[PDB]
Scaffold this active site. Structure first.
Site, PDB file in Angstrom:
ATOM      1  N   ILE A  95       1.070  -1.451   0.127  1.00 23.05           N
ATOM      2  CA  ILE A  95      -0.216   0.199  -0.344  1.00 23.05           C
ATOM      3  C   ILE A  95       0.700   1.031  -0.040  1.00 23.05           C
ATOM      4  CG2 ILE A  95      -1.666   1.176   0.737  1.00 23.05           C
ATOM      5  CD1 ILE A  95      -2.845  -0.973   2.703  1.00 23.05           C
ATOM      6  N   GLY A 149      -3.612  19.414   2.569  1.00 17.96           N
ATOM      7  CA  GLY A 149      -2.242  19.802   2.533  1.00 17.96           C
ATOM      8  C   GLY A 149      -1.100  19.008   1.709  1.00 17.96           C
ATOM      9  N   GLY A 173       2.968 -15.912 -16.345  1.00 22.22           N
ATOM     10  CA  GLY A 173       3.861 -16.376 -15.439  1.00 22.22           C
ATOM     11  C   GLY A 173       3.206 -16.186 -14.274  1.00 22.22           C
ATOM     12  N   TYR A 224      -1.726   0.148 -14.689  1.00 22.25           N
ATOM     13  CA  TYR A 224      -2.986   0.763 -14.603  1.00 22.25           C
ATOM     14  C   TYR A 224      -3.862   0.780 -13.358  1.00 22.25           C
ATOM     15  CZ  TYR A 224      -6.255   2.251 -18.239  1.00 22.25           C
ATOM     16  OH  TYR A 224      -7.241   3.720 -18.715  1.00 22.25           O
ATOM     17  N   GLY A 269     -11.942  -0.209 -18.278  1.00 23.61           N
ATOM     18  CA  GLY A 269     -11.202   1.155 -18.231  1.00 23.61           C
ATOM     19  C   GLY A 269     -10.642   2.051 -19.400  1.00 23.61           C
ATOM     20  N   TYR A 276      -9.709   4.686 -22.092  1.00 22.71           N
ATOM     21  CA  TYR A 276     -10.234   5.953 -22.371  1.00 22.71           C
ATOM     22  C   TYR A 276     -10.897   6.398 -23.194  1.00 22.71           C
ATOM     23  CZ  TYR A 276      -5.909   7.482 -19.774  1.00 22.71           C
ATOM     24  OH  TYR A 276      -4.463   7.957 -18.894  1.00 22.71           O
ATOM     25  N   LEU A 291      -8.130  16.714  -7.684  1.00 19.58           N
ATOM     26  CA  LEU A 291      -8.250  15.450  -7.718  1.00 19.58           C
ATOM     27  C   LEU A 291      -9.317  15.033  -5.946  1.00 19.58           C
ATOM     28  CD1 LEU A 291      -6.573  12.052  -7.737  1.00 19.58           C
ATOM     29  CD2 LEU A 291      -4.808  13.877  -6.281  1.00 19.58           C
ATOM     30  N   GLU A 292      -8.864  16.138  -4.833  1.00 19.23           N
ATOM     31  CA  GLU A 292      -9.418  16.293  -3.928  1.00 19.23           C
ATOM     32  C   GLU A 292     -10.935  15.982  -4.778  1.00 19.23           C
ATOM     33  OE1 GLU A 292      -8.662  17.969   0.198  1.00 19.23           O
ATOM     34  OE2 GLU A 292     -10.376  19.457  -1.272  1.00 19.23           O
ATOM     35  N   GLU A 351      -0.556   7.384 -15.190  1.00 20.00           N
ATOM     36  CA  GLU A 351       0.004   8.075 -15.849  1.00 20.00           C
ATOM     37  C   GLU A 351       1.705   8.557 -15.560  1.00 20.00           C
ATOM     38  OE1 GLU A 351      -2.861   6.911 -19.261  1.00 20.00           O
ATOM     39  OE2 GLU A 351      -0.380   6.791 -18.373  1.00 20.00           O
ATOM     40  N   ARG A 354       3.649   6.596 -14.656  1.00 19.42           N
ATOM     41  CA  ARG A 354       4.235   5.731 -16.817  1.00 19.42           C
ATOM     42  C   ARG A 354       5.332   6.584 -17.214  1.00 19.42           C
ATOM     43  NH1 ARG A 354      -0.638   3.449 -19.757  1.00 19.42           N
ATOM     44  NH2 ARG A 354      -0.974   1.532 -18.979  1.00 19.42           N
TER      45      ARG A 354
END
Ligand SMILES: O=C(O)c1cc2c(s1)-c1ccccc1CC2
Ligand SMILES: [Cl-]
Ligand SMILES: [Cl-]
Ligand SMILES: [Cl-]
Length: 258
Positions: free
Chosen positions: A5, A12, A47, A77, A118, A120, A141-142, A174, A177
């Site tokens: 995790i 903040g 594998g 992803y 999933g 785009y 994002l919040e 992304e 990546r």
């Protein structure tokens, strides 16, 4: 008993704290990666033991809600997420992948598999918005985190859930990546801005699979044929070799080499 995790909060959040977060995500993703060559290659799907297959990203915000995204280490992803006592999964491509996700969130009471994948193209359709018109930043994002949580209580409708996936996938998957996309997010956090991504970001996202193939199939670093990318002003140019992308792309999906 549990996959690794990483934690991040928008409450903040700073340039430093977002930099630490993406670095940790890359660290967990590349535990089993091949790092002998110019660019790291994520572990081969075929594998890979099931206890090495996933990592978990746990997100919170100012309202202190928490959701946990599950990431496939083979392509970095998002395959699904957990909120409260429920887990939700994108539709899998094949039987092996369908079997693999039954090892995620095994302790939730309620498990659901969306009818859609999933990618785009599909998520843009459900959201009613192209990536070109969806703002990214700490603010977005919040909001995405609260929306993901409140889907489990009936408070979030599917178009808003789709737009929240698009925000999370870009700012985490992304950004891990591509060093280039990490910098694009870093600039937004630095000046406290929210803005939709420019054409260079979108074209890089659309090209990750093709670039992984051209790089791993290259001969002495030279591509067998060019890949076309975009600058931030939309203008186009061709890349012919691996080296110029070493500062740009940080992770690659495994590809066979002849
Ligand atoms: O807006 C600009 O000036 C540029 C955007 C990009 C550039 S330059 C690039 C140059 C070499 C290799 C990969 C890239 C990715 C996107
Ligand atoms: Cl740096
Ligand atoms: Cl399942
Ligand atoms: Cl569908």
């Amino acid at each position: 008993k549990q996959y690794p995790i990483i934690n991040f909060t928008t409450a903040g959040a700073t340039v430093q704290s977002y930099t630490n977060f993406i670095r940790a995500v890359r660290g967990r993703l590349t535990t089993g990666a091949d790092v002998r060559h110019e660019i790291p290659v994520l572990p081969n799907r075929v594998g890979l033991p099931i206890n090495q297959r996933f990592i978990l990203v746990e997100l919170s915000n100012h309202a202190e809600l928490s959701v946990t995204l599950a990431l496939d280490v083979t392509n970095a992803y998002v395959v699904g997420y957990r909120a409260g006592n429920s887990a939700y999964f994108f539709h899998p491509d094949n039987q092996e992948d369908a079997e693999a996700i039954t090892h995620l969130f095994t302790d939730v009471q309620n498990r659901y598999t969306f009818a859609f994948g999933g990618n785009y193209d599909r998520l843009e359709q459900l959201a009613g918005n192209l990536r070109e018109n969806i703002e990214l930043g700490n603010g977005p994002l919040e909001e995405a985190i609260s929306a993901l949580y409140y889907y489990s209580t009936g408070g979030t409708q599917l178009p808003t859930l789709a737009r929240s996936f698009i925000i999370c996938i870009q700012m985490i998957s992304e950004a891990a990546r591509f060093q280039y996309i990490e910098g694009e997010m870093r600039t937004r956090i630095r000046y406290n801005r929210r803005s939709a991504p420019d054409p260079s970001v979108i074209t890089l996202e659309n090209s990750w699979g093709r670039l992984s193939t051209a790089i791993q199939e290259s001969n002495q670093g030279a591509f067998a044929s060019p890949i076309q990318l975009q600058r931030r002003n939309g203008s186009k140019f061709s890349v012919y070799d691996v080296s110029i992308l070493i500062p740009i792309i940080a992770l690659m999906v495994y590809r066979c080499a002849p």
